[PDB]
Structure 1
Amino acid sequence: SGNAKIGHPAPNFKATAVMPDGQFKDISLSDYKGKYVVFFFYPLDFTFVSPTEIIAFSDRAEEFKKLNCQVIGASVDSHFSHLAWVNTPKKQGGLGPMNIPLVSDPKRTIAQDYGVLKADEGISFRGLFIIDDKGILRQITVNDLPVGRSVDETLRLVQAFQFTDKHGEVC
């Protein structure tokens, strides 16, 4: 199930995020019209594989910015939980300061809209979605919980979609 379909508008959302400046902020996917978006879910805060993924995307956010691409992470934890994790230094097992926003999905409706809810557990799988600058979903990636994602592979995909966007442009 879910409503994430290739070639269709990616499901919009409006949710509280912890922004890179460390403050909250209600943001919507539609805020990022005109930019590509990498939108990725992770199961929950304060775990072992997820911080390595989050820090990798945050550390390399400049490479996405050079592609006019916004990276957004998300999980079902509360926005206070996200902020606590950001405020915990990397040296102590936290995220430390972030270059990307982290969305809170406490009612699980965004995870359900993207088809990545592990219903038996109330957490999301490791879903990653590439959305173009028109808001159209271009790529779906979902990993079972034990195996993380690759920033290199994500950049390869974003670059490839932008390259092919140039043949016979819809106008």
Structure 2
Amino acid sequence: MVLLPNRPAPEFKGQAVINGEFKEICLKDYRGKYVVLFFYPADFTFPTEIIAFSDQVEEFNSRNCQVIACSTDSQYSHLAWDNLDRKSGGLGHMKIPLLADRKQEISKAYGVFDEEDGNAFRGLFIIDPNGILRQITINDKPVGRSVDETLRLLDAFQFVEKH
């Protein structure tokens, strides 16, 4: 029921910026597509640091998936890290969605919140297009998160749903 696969997964309401545009998205929105939602503690940290997957998002287009990052920082907090380029301490331009949960709520849905520092963990969540939870992945804050393995865990469930 809570953080467990093959069962409903908590359906949130997101408020964020896509390609430099504030957009209102929710889990009922992206439904029908593979969703991967992985959180992070805060914006502007030092790992992947949410870089690879950005420009590697394309492989997920070949795989029919949505790549979404979330942080306790609000839209405004994400926007700034968006516009300011990499050379300046930014990410340059974003090839992927940056979802702001300021309300703190979507993280509490994922058991990903840390009372100590008051922000979400490196926990990632794989979803098929069923609104159903599939694979659970949660890494320590200080520890960076897998890329190719992300995509591989993906094809696997694809394999099984298919065969």
Same fold? TM cut 0.5: yes
Distance 1:56 1:13 in 2: 26
Q: Percent same amino acid among aligned pairs?
A: 63
TM-score by length of 1: 0.91
Report if the CA contact (8 A) 1:4-1:11 is conserved.
no
Shift of 1:144: 1.1
Distance 1:72 1:112 in 2: 17
Aligned counterpart, 1:8: 7
Q: Over aligned residue pairs, what C-alpha RMSD do you find?
A: 1.3
Q: CA offsets per residue over residues 78-102 of structure 1, 9 Å max, x none?
A: 1111000011101122111111111
Aligned counterpart, 2:52: 56
Alignment pair present for 1:108 and 2:104: yes
Shift of 1:129: 0.5
Q: Which runs of 5+ in 1 are unaligned?
A: none
TM-score by length of 2: 0.95
Shift of 1:151: 1.1
- SS in structure 2 at match of 1:107: coil
Q: Which runs of 5+ in 2 are unaligned?
A: none
Q: For this pair of structures, how many residues does the alignment match? A: 163
Which 4+ residue blocks in structure 1 deviate beyond 2 angstroms? 2-5
Alignment pair present for 1:162 and 2:161: no
Shift of 1:28: 0.5
Alignment pair present for 1:127 and 2:127: no
Alignment pair present for 1:144 and 2:143: no
Shift of 1:3: 3.5
Distance 1:53 1:162 in 2: 27
